[PDB]
Design a protein around this ligand. Structure first.
Ligand SMILES: Nc1ncnc2c1ncn2[C@@H]1O[C@H](COP(=O)(O)OP(=O)(O)OP(=O)(O)O)[C@@H](O)[C@H]1O
Ligand SMILES: [Mg+2]
Lengths: 267, 223
């Protein structure tokens, strides 16, 4: 196998605090009601008000804003646990429950121009207009293969290494068995996730007059892919990160940045 | 560069006929047109710019406009001023000039370099712009020349360049009258084919009329 963490104090504390916040039953059950509503509506993305989160635990709010990936993963674990506690079958139906953010971001609320490298790995709420969109493509998150020669059925999993170090091993699609038996993929059994890329440009009525406009690339995934079309004045709340380059040998030190959207809103 | 030069030019100035000497020395290859040569001498030597406080700018440039029927050496006058004056740039109302009146920003054809090509009005910031065929200019050229003459500045708002760069040139223009023959029956404004605001910014307006005068024709043919 490999390294497996046992006592991650920070992760345990984050999960405990997020589950305490999501309990909400004594705190007039606002997020309890929201979780129940999403359960009924058959949704798997909870939108959390950062203002309420800060009011409950300013420490957790700051940690989430300044450390996006870790705290979002902890929040999603807590949300999945809460969803299982309220209703186990739905939790088992949906593998991962996502968390998007909303509310008043003191300094993190920026535009494509003011969005600088100081916000990398942070939660940023960027306003703008969608200059272009891409076709919704499916990325395989879990492929299933069947071997006619041996009747075996294997299942490979691919992790979401969009903004993480990725190696050729993780992104190799099996095409033979260990004995060189051709495989056949079971598309129906396989798990795909819809993925789209949009471009957010600073609103012309907001951009400094006479200058060229500033843009940013945004990545949308399952349940957020088709939330906008070109010309939409959208607010994208997401995590700003550097996209890994291809395996090189010489690096120029230049890193394309992108916004992994965790929530999209229209006017 | 002027040591014995500066020694002798003072004596030439004290000569006491230096004004007439200069007026006769302008355009030695052009016969007659003493008034035009005198105006060109005054334009070449220029005036004195001033600005009460920093709020009442007044130009010190003597603008000249030679409006004349064909065969009157307006082009030769402009070319001589190009040859003599330092920082003298020749542009034409047509599109067949190396430079143009209006400034743009583009990648240069030869240098392949993204360059802010300022106009022929700016390439003579402290010199002379010789605008031939002044009556045959585009709308953008007319607006650019209006801006330069009235403001002595050129404003670009093109790609991301929002700038205002100074063009304090002296404009010597050549033009033809409506119909190709100046008619004194009508006034200069309605003879020249130019807007009144454009005309107003000219200090000297040389009406180069052509008439069939025996002696003048004989002397010009001799020359
Ligand atoms: N006063 C003059 N003395 C000597 N040569 C002259 C005189 N006027 C015209 N010429 C000569 O006659 C010809 C006509 O001159 P030029 O080509 O400059 O005309 P122009 O005034 O520019 O005409 P247009 O406005 O029609 O273009 C040229 O060869 C020029 O050298
Ligand atoms: Mg001419």
């Amino acid at each position: 196998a490999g390294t497996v963490v046992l006592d991650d104090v920070e992760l345990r504390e984050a999960q405990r605090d997020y589950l305490d916040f999501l309990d909400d039953e004594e705190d007039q059950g606002i997020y309890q009601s929201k979780v129940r509503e999403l359960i009924s509506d058959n949704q798997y993305r909870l939108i959390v008000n950062v203002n309420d989160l800060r009011r409950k635990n300013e420490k957790r709010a700051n940690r989430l804003l300044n450390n996006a990936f870790e705290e979002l993963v902890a929040f999603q674990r807590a949300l999945k646990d809460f969803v299982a506690s309220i209703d186990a079958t739905y939790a088992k139906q949906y593998e991962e429950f996502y968390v998007g953010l909303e509310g008043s971001f003191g300094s993190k609320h920026v535009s494509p121009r003011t969005l600088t490298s100081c916000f990398l790995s942070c939660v940023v709420c960027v306003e703008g207009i969608v200059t272009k969109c891409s076709l919704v493509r499916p990325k395989v998150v879990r492929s299933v293969h069947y071997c006619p020669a041996t009747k075996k059925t294997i299942e490979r999993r691919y992790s979401d290494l969009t903004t993480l170090v990725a190696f050729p091993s993780s992104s190799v699609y099996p095409t033979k068995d260990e004995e060189n038996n051709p495989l056949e993929t079971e598309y129906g059994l396989s798990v795909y996730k819809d993925h789209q890329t949009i471009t957010i440009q600073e609103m012309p009525e907001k951009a400094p007059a006479g200058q060229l406009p500033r843009s940013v690339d945004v990545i949308l995934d399952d349940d957020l892919v088709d939330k906008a079309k070109p010309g939409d004045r959208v607010q994208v709340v997401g995590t700003y990160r550097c996209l890994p380059g291809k395996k090189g040998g010489y690096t120029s030190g230049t890193f394309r940045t992108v916004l992994i959207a965790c929530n999209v809103k229209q006017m | 560069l002027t040591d014995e030069d500066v020694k002798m030019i003072t004596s030439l100035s004290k000569d006491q006929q230096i004004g007439e000497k200069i007026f006769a020395s302008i355009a030695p290859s052009i016969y007659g047109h003493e008034d035009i040569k005198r105006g060109l001498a005054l334009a070449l030597f220029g005036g004195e710019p001033k600005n009460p406080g920093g709020k009442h700018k007044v130009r010190g440039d003597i603008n000249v406009l030679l409006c004349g029927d064909p065969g009157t050496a307006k082009s030769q006058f402009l070319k001589y001023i190009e040859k003599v004056s330092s920082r003298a740039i020749f542009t034409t109302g047509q599109g067949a000039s190396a430079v143009g009146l209006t400034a743009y920003v583009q990648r240069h054809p030869v240098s392949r370099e993204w360059t802010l090509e300022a106009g022929a009005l700016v390439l003579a910031d402290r010199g002379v712009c010789l605008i031939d065929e002044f009556d045959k200019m585009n709308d953008q050229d007319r607006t650019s020349i209006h801006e330069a003459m009235e403001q002595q500045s050129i404003s670009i708002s093109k790609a991301g360049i929002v700038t205002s760069l100074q063009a304090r040139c002296t404009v010597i223009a050549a033009a033809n009258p409506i119909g190709g023959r100046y008619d004194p029956s009508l006034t200069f404004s309605e003879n020249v084919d130019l807007t009144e605001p454009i005309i107003s910014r000219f200090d000297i307006l040389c009406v180069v009329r052509d008439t069939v005068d025996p002696v003048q024709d004989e002397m010009l043919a001799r020359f």
